[PDB]
Write a protein that binds this ligand. Structure first.
Ligand code: HEM
Ligand code: HEM
Lengths: 144, 148
């Protein structure tokens, strides 16, 4: 199961960096969402928010132009679309592409590092390393 | 022959992250087949001249052979003092502190991720072990899904 694998990767990222929230989106070449896995938000809150992300705002930027991005305040970025009603507040941000050499498929991202600090150089390196493993997983599912 | 390019980049990045974050002087990973024969070995922290002097890659013996045989996390204050120790070959850096963990999925283990010589002179911490285990699990995912 691909989503179980992607969830394991999100868990490792969130726990090791010590972020409150973690997520991964995988999309097709038209930018349609194929998979969205996440941790940090209870299902009651999920039910209030409603539909899962479509890959807009800051995530849209990263889908169009895959490369690592860290932000002190996600809502301050020019590409920021804003959260939907009932979504938890989130401030600090780290996002990296989920990719292989040939192609990028998705984005692994974290918000709200514990105790309020920005994501570090070391956090970005770690998250890139985990994402690469997810990149291989996604590339394999696309063949198999 | 050579490892799949994406797999190799991923494993090397994982070794680097593990080595960097636990502040190890040296880091390595061996990957083996189902019969436990070593196929690939990637490493960092040893200069290229010392590599030429050592002259042959590890076969998976000593304390590593133990981890290959019995895939479990293993921390040691002095790797050379372990009764499984085979000893380092000529020209190989002396290495004292050791942290090694299986590269695996639920059903099968594929290899070992290992770090030596913490910069602080101290043994690898419990925190160090947890971080390396998670990185090894991602390496396990990579190996399992790697391009045929
Ligand atoms: C738990 C991990 C999550 C993280 C780290 C996260 C993070 C984000 C980020 C960074 C944005 C872009 C904000 C902006 O551009 O201003 C966003 C937008 C959004 N999020 Fe969340 N989110 C998470 C979970 C969820 C969940 C579970 C839902 C739905 C139940 C959700 C629904 C949305 C929607 C609808 C948007 C608007 C843009 C879009 O549709 O892509 N998010 N989120
Ligand atoms: C740079 C990261 C490295 C680490 C962390 C590392 C670690 C180790 C450890 C823990 C042992 C077992 C010691 C014992 O059981 O007494 C060992 C043995 C050995 N190492 Fe290294 N090593 C590294 C690099 C290298 C390189 C680059 C070479 C060759 C160019 C090499 C060649 C060997 C050989 C030949 C053995 C003897 C046992 C065997 O053949 O498996 N090592 N190493």
């Amino acid at each position: 199961d691909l989503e179980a694998t992607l969830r394991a990767i999100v868990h490792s990222a969130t726990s090791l960096v010590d972020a409150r929230y973690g997520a991964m989106e995988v999309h097709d070449r038209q930018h349609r969402v194929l998979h969205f896995v996440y941790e940090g938000i209870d299902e009651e809150t999920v039910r209030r928010i409603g539909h899962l992300p479509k890959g807009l705002g800051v995530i849209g930027l990263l889908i169009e132009d895959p490369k690592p991005l860290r932000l002190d305040d996600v809502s301050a970025h020019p590409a920021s679309i804003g959260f939907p009603p009932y979504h938890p507040p989130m401030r600090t941000f780290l996002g990296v592409p989920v990719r292989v050499r040939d192609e990028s498929f998705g984005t692994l991202y974290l918000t709200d590092k514990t105790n309020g600090q920005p994501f570090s150089d070391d956090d970005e390196v770690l998250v890139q390393a985990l994402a690469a493993a997810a990149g291989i997983a996604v590339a394999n599912a696309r063949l198999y």
